[PDB]
């Protein structure tokens, strides 16, 4: 039974059995429903929950014209790169937030789900790239990165490196290298007088 009174399916985003790699991050659009962010913030299992341009307390009291739910995986030390005005291999080459970002960033350690003994190599991240990504740009290219002036012709080797690279998550790693599942909510405020929202 589907109705618009029904709440938005945030379970599908947070409660997925597996996330995408950060270089090819997923984007779900939540629309034509009623969202309740009270359950999200109240959860005591979110090690990172930073919101930009909007306080999480006034989320249910706000009017959005559009909502995006981006989800991926990185390692613990790389969580601090998922914020406006950051750099690093993740913010420059994998996922970049705008300087006027209006949304929230939700992260939780997922070492019981995305690390295997012997290394879970399923998750990848782009390491080599000529110029930085633009905000909300996804690069799934697999072209051999040419470092020198000698072309590589698609072949790996010296000055000719694969742009992607795996995390190899092992449960014995330090928390700075353990897998962390991330959900980034992008809001689209309604241009309306204060007397409304």
């Amino acid at each position, epitope marked *: 039974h589907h109705h618009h009174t029904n709440l938005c399916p945030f*379970g*599908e985003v947070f*409660n997925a*059995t597996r996330f995408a790699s950060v270089y090819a991050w997923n984007r779900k659009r939540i629309s034509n429903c009623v969202a309740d962010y009270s359950v999200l913030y109240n959860s005591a299992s979110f090690s990172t929950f930073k919101c930009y341009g909007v306080s999480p307390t006034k989320l249910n009291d706000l009017c959005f014209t559009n909502v995006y739910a981006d989800s991926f995986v990185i390692r613990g030390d790389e969580v601090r790169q998922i914020a406006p005005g950051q750099t690093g291999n993740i913010a420059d080459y994998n996922y970049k937030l705008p300087d006027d970002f209006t949304g929230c960033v939700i992260a939780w*350690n*997922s070492n019981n*789900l*995305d690390s*295997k003994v012997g290394g879970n190599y399923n998750y990848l991240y782009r390491l080599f790239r000529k110029s930085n990504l633009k905000p909300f740009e996804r690069d799934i290219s697999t072209e051999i990165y040419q470092a020198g002036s000698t072309p590589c012709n698609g072949v790996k080797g010296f000055n000719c490196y694969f742009p992607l690279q795996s995390y190899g998550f092992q449960p014995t790693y330090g928390v700075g290298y353990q897998p962390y599942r991330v959900v980034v909510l992008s809001f689209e405020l309604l241009h309306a007088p204060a007397t409304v929202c």
Partner: antibody
Amino acid sequence: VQLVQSGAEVKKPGESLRISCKGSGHNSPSYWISWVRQMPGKGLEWMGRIDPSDSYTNYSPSFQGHVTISADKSISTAYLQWSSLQASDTAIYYCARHVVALTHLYPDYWGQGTLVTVSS
Amino acid sequence: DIQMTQSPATLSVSPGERATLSCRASQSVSSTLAWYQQKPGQAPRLLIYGASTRATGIPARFSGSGSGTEFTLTISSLQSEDFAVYYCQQYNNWSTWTFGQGTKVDIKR
């Protein structure tokens, strides 16, 4: 939370067969239903598992080239199919679920099972 | 794959005594283990998941423990409806889910 399998079957060796297992009350479209074999007096042996929404299998090495597992998320139903049955396949077949709970996994309901008897 | 081996094969415990069941993994499994109970003719029933967490609706006399490769299921104060076969299944997320052979719990005599 509720899974319902198909009724007991009886087939001659070499005949095709597919049993069903419908679920309900799942956390989200992305769960982990799994098939498990149990011979008359043997023990438990895992076979495969699917995420219906994604339909991504993970067949067990001892079962990969033998049975095919499919799913139809419209009816939230999981399937287990034999292209050619042999007498060794005579066993009880359960389906179990494994929902995700952010931090970790959690197995909930366990199918009542379907008895299969391959004999000519 | 990750071979699961249990011990002993079968045991014997009087009502009220403490049953002790072990489970060994061929390589580390962190803590993603689960104990089950299969009474004769019935479908298996989950008792412990995550090595130590008790399933909701299960008597508090059962308890699980361990980490890495060795684990233990303890049945404090054994009852008369506790006679079955107990297995240990691991469910590391991007891995073949493996199963133990089981252990049978009986009346001491």
